[PDB]
Design a protein around this ligand. Sequence first.
Ligand SMILES: CCCCCCCC/C=C\CCCCCCCC(=O)OC[C@H](O)CO
Ligand SMILES: *C/C=C(C)/C=C/C=C(C)/C=C/C1=C(C)CCCC1(C)C
Ligand SMILES: CCCCCCCC/C=C\CCCCCCCC(=O)O
Ligand SMILES: CCCCCCCC/C=C\CCCCCCCC(=O)O
Ligand SMILES: [Br-]
Ligand SMILES: [Br-]
Ligand SMILES: [Br-]
Ligand SMILES: [Br-]
Ligand SMILES: [Br-]
Ligand SMILES: [Br-]
Ligand SMILES: [Br-]
Length: 262
Amino acid sequence: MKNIESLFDYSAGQFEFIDHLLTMGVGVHFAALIFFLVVSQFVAPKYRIATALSCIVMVSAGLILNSQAVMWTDAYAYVDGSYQLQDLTFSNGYRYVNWMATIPCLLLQLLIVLNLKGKELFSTATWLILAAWGMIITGYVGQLYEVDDIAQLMIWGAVSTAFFVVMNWIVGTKIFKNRATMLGGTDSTITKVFWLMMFAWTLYPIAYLVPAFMNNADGVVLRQLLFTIADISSKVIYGLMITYIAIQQSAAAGYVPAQQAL
Ligand SMILES: CCCCCCCC/C=C\CCCCCCCC(=O)OC[C@H](O)CO
Ligand SMILES: *C/C=C(C)/C=C/C=C(C)/C=C/C1=C(C)CCCC1(C)C
Ligand SMILES: CCCCCCCC/C=C\CCCCCCCC(=O)O
Ligand SMILES: CCCCCCCC/C=C\CCCCCCCC(=O)O
Ligand SMILES: [Br-]
Ligand SMILES: [Br-]
Ligand SMILES: [Br-]
Ligand SMILES: [Br-]
Ligand SMILES: [Br-]
Ligand SMILES: [Br-]
Ligand SMILES: [Br-]
């Protein structure tokens, strides 16, 4: 009731497009899961946790997308030419709770391939996860108001954006100060990962603001489209680049299965 999805009836085309976006997302993540599983054997032990974290992200995201898909079809029924709300079973909040889990995994695998270790790894990961959780929690509270109090959505979103900016400053600083440690030419690749991250993660706050500038059924569809683009880019494409960096550094470090795989 606190999300704009509950305010509208949906045409068959809108309803089925959203359903298909979610089910396609399930398939893409679970297909990627198998890929990350199989290639982990070609990653040196020092970096293998990075590929395992991608497996965890894939199944976490895939399970939540699958839950959303079923909740979507549970909540609406085709009545008198449109899909109409029948039950209070759909909200975007499950995405937020999930981010609490997937964002730390995405950040940790970056720090691993940057060759951080020991106290700097633990300390950097701690500040980053705290900043990320602050961002997610304040965003979560904000979107509880996307129907009733747009002013409060904006203020919680400004607080959330402050955490986001500080998080990105930490990430960028560690990347640019440590890329000279990277092997196999991946000092060039990691800079592209950072820019991919900036692009993909910024799509989420744009989706968060849809209720302010497109409060109608097509805005609901656009938000799910943006989430889909952002999810694939921030989790799947990002994970593929992290895995490439892990294998390339594994090979440059003399790990034979990595060398043969490449
Ligand atoms: C809610 C309103 C708040 C509005 C606030 C607007 C400020 C945005 C400016 C920068 C964002 C920081 C993004 C992080 C970019 C990377 C920075 C970095 O990596 O620094 C390089 C380092 O200094 C070299 O070694
Ligand atoms: C796979 C999911 C990812 C990488 C989620 C990332 C989410 C964000 C970067 C969220 C950012 C937000 C803001 C900066 C302000 C508005 C509220 C959020 C939480 C959507
Ligand atoms: C309040 C929340 C704080 C959460 C802090 C999280 C701490 C995570 C610390 C680092 C995890 C590293 C574990 C994997 C080791 C990889 C090193 C390697 O195998 O080469
Ligand atoms: C239970 C798991 C959550 C772990 C939280 C620990 C990390 C803390 C990070 C920043 C907290 C930001 C506080 C925002 C809460 C105010 C919203 C409200 O209470 O209405
Ligand atoms: Br239609
Ligand atoms: Br239509
Ligand atoms: Br190793
Ligand atoms: Br997720
Ligand atoms: Br179905
Ligand atoms: Br490259
Ligand atoms: Br939201």
